[PDB]
């Protein structure tokens, strides 16, 4: 009952109950019904616990024939992983990368380069899909004149996914225009 | 010496010294050399103080003939405002908007619409420049195979601004392609 997977699941469950600020090892201990120094045998502190959480979320969702398809699905599965739990995005911030994740980075780069992306452009492209996705979820995860009214009605009805996808599409097409030779 | 501007300047200075997590009214009090309940007359708590900080940063930098120029400069001056202080980005998160800021939102929308953006696309465009910029600065503000090596050397030399601008440019051009009639 403090097998790794149970600690993690319990922590994730806690995150949804209390969010990132609320979550503390003391409470984790209490949830699991063990004494804090027992938990502490398994889990140094809060940073260590966030790190595993970030990784685990990514492992359930980061499960992803052209580069425009890879980019897009990539962004999507990342978005889903951050959405998966309360404050997922804040959680993911300032996580230190794993051995596999650098492997993957190398792969993605080898692939995009082998589609006649310069390495520079390879990086710029990942980077920017990266930032934009994170940017979106952070904001999605927070808390009288006419255009603003229509804009409430508008977003009331659609939520964040249609905008998010749009952006992403604009992004990748901006990249496509990059890809063609001069200017 | 606890005129509003001095409280704010002192707080900003503190933020750079200690960052967002470190900053506390207790320390603010101590810096200014006043007793905490005196400070407290002026400043309810930390959230209230963050809010003014966010606003003030924006007022120094958010000082911004086509829509591609407005979009781009807009993103830039926002980026600069978040960069202006340690953890600026984290600060800006979850700030509640001012009276002027809704005015401005209305304006920007009236403008873009009057360039034959549908309102939907107006929103999607601001939104996405918005997210992408925030996304970038958050990450800029944190803390063995060949392509990764070149990629270190690469980013060693350039820092975050060249990538950031690239993305932005891709973005706006993706939007341009949107703007043309069907498909």
């Amino acid at each position: 009952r403090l097998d790794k997977s149970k600690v993690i699941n319990s922590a994730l469950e806690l995150l949804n109950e209390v969010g990132i600020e609320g979550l503390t090892t003391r409470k984790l201990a209490q949830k699991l019904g063990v004494e804090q120094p027992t938990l502490y045998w398994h889990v140094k502190n809060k940073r260590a616990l966030l790190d595993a959480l970030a990784i685990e979320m990514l492992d359930r969702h980061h499960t992803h024939e052209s580069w425009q398809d890879f980019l897009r699905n990539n962004a999507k599965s990342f978005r889903n992983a951050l959405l998966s739990h309360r404050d997922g995005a804040k959680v993911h911030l300032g996580t230190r990368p794993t051995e596999k994740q650098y492997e993957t980075l190398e792969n993605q780069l080898a692939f995009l380069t082998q589609q006649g992306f310069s390495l520079e452009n390879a990086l710029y492209a990942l980077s920017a899909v990266g930032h934009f996705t994170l940017g979106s979820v952070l904001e999605d995860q927070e808390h009288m004149p006419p255009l603003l009214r229509q804009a409430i009605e508008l977003f009331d009805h659609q939520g964040a996914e249609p905008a998010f996808l749009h952006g992403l599409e604009s992004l990748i097409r901006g990249f496509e225009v990059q890809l063609t030779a001069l200017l | 010496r606890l005129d509003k501007s001095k409280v704010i300047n002192s707080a900003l200075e503190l933020l750079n010294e200690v960052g967002i997590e470190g900053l506390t009214t207790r320390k603010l009090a101590q810096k200014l050399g006043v007793e905490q309940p005196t400070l407290y007359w002026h400043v309810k708590n930390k959230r209230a103080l963050l809010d003014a900080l966010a606003i003030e940063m924006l007022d120094r930098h958010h000082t911004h003939e086509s829509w591609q120029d407005f979009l781009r400069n807009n993103a830039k001056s926002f980026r600069n405002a978040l960069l202006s202080h340690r953890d600026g980005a984290k600060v800006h998160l979850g700030t509640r908007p001012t009276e002027k800021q809704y005015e401005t939102l209305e304006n920007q929308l009236a403008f873009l619409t009057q360039q034959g953006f549908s309102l939907e696309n107006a929103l999607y465009a601001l939104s996405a420049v918005g997210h992408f910029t925030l996304g970038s600065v958050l990450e800029d503000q944190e803390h063995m195979p060949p392509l990764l090596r070149q990629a270190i050397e690469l980013f060693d030399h350039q820092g975050a601004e060249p990538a950031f601008l690239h993305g932005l440019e891709s973005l706006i051009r993706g939007f341009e392609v949107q703007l043309t009639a069907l498909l």
Binding site: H62, T95, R96, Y102, L105, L123 | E139, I152
Partner: peptide
Amino acid sequence: EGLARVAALARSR
């Protein structure tokens, strides 16, 4: 150096 930049990229992989 630009080390953290690459860390940041790997971190979302």
